Design an enzyme around this catalytic site. Sequence first.
Site, PDB file in Angstrom:
ATOM      1  N   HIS A  40      -7.286  32.099  -8.046  1.00  0.00           N
ATOM      2  CA  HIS A  40      -8.423  31.394  -7.923  1.00  0.00           C
ATOM      3  C   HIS A  40      -8.528  30.282  -6.636  1.00  0.00           C
ATOM      4  CE1 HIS A  40      -5.658  28.658  -9.644  1.00  0.00           C
ATOM      5  NE2 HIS A  40      -6.345  27.536  -8.872  1.00  0.00           N
ATOM      6  N   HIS A 125      -9.206  28.491  -0.043  1.00  0.00           N
ATOM      7  CA  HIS A 125      -8.329  29.360  -0.081  1.00  0.00           C
ATOM      8  C   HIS A 125      -7.849  29.791  -1.521  1.00  0.00           C
ATOM      9  CE1 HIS A 125      -5.864  25.747  -0.272  1.00  0.00           C
ATOM     10  NE2 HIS A 125      -4.808  26.423  -0.849  1.00  0.00           N
TER      11      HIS A 125
END
Length: 184
Positions: A40, A125
Site C-alpha cells: 500500500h 511510495h
Amino acid sequence: MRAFIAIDVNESVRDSLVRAQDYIGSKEAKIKFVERENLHITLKFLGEITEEQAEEIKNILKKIAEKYKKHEVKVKGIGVFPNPNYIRVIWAGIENDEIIREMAREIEDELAKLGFKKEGNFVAHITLGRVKFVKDKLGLTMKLKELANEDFGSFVVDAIELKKSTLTPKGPIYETLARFELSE
Ligand SMILES: [Cl-]
C-alpha cells in the site's frame, strides 16, 4: 494499538508488484519482501495509539477524505532509501502524487494538533521490501537500476484507510479499522 493511515492499490498493480519482487529475488541481497496483502501507500505511521484516539482520527479523516476527488495514479520506477549507496528500503514511486501529497500534509497538520509528531518530506511510495544486509552490491545496484523507470501499472485512489498492525513471528497482519471513500 499500532496504527497507520493508508491508501490501497488494486489487484493488477498488486500482481505486477509481486512479480517485480520475485524478479529482484534474494541473490543480490537478503530482503524481507512485503506480503501481497500489505502492499500500500503509507500516508502516515501513527505508532502506538488508544482506541479513543483511534476514534478522533476517524472523524478527522472523514472530513478530509471528502474534500478530495478520486483519481487514477500510476505506479512507476524503483527508488531506494536512504541513498543508492546506503540501501535499506526498496520502493516503487507514484507518477504524480501531489493530490496524495496534499492529503498527507493535511492529515499531518490535523493530527499534529492532537500531539502527533510530523514527518520527513512525504514521498508517495509503495515499499516493496527492506534489505537486512547486502550480499553482492554490484548485483543489487544493477538489478535495481534496470527497474529505475518501470511502469508497473495504475490504480484508482478511491479511499483512505485507518489501519491496525499486529506483529506476528514472521509477518505483520493488517486490519482495516475504517475506510473513507473519496469524493467524485
Ligand atoms: Cl520504513
